[PDB]
Amino acid sequence: GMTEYKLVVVGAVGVGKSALTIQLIQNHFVDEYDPTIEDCYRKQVVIDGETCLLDILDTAGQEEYSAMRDQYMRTGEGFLCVFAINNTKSFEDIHHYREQIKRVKDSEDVPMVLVGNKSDLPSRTVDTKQAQDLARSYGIPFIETSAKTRQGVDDAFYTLVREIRKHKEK
């Protein structure tokens, strides 16, 4: 089979995880998607000439059993850590996602990309500088996205694939 990349989208409720995922998979924006639905999506794409399958888990937070969270963290190859640029708490929450994923995977080298979504809004509480500073401290890429306009969406997911490739070649 063609290579499959298992990507997991995490972040606080309301930041735009579902809207980002649906833009990637279906190329349209969704005003409303039930905040409590978690699902696994698939899409065949070409990234730098490689035809590959993206498996994308659009997470929704707590699971029936915590073992389910640990399972997807251990299985997932790369993580999009999403906050919204107008939601400071969601940005603060990134620290916990970073830690928890590394903790489950028992690894210091986990492919991740920091995503600041809702960039189409002038309303902003998290400046680009602050997010850059955090990404710098993690040694991971940072991309500002808008699920609404699609700006940065392919870059976010494709950059995460490229981070997974760098990890695999070691």
Ligand SMILES: Nc1nc2c(ncn2[C@@H]2O[C@H](COP(=O)(O)OP(=O)(O)O)[C@@H](O)[C@H]2O)c(=O)[nH]1
């Ligand atoms: N303006 C704007 N609104 C967005 C964007 N992404 C998501 N939203 C809105 O933010 C709310 C939460 O989005 P959703 O995808 O359900 O977030 P999730 O809980 O992280 O899955 C919804 O009202 C979306 O329409 C974006 O890039 N720009």
Ligand SMILES: Sc1ccc(Br)cc1
């Ligand atoms: S679609 C999908 C992606 C990543 C995991 Br881990 C599980 C399901």
Ligand SMILES: [Mg+2]
């Ligand atoms: Mg959602």
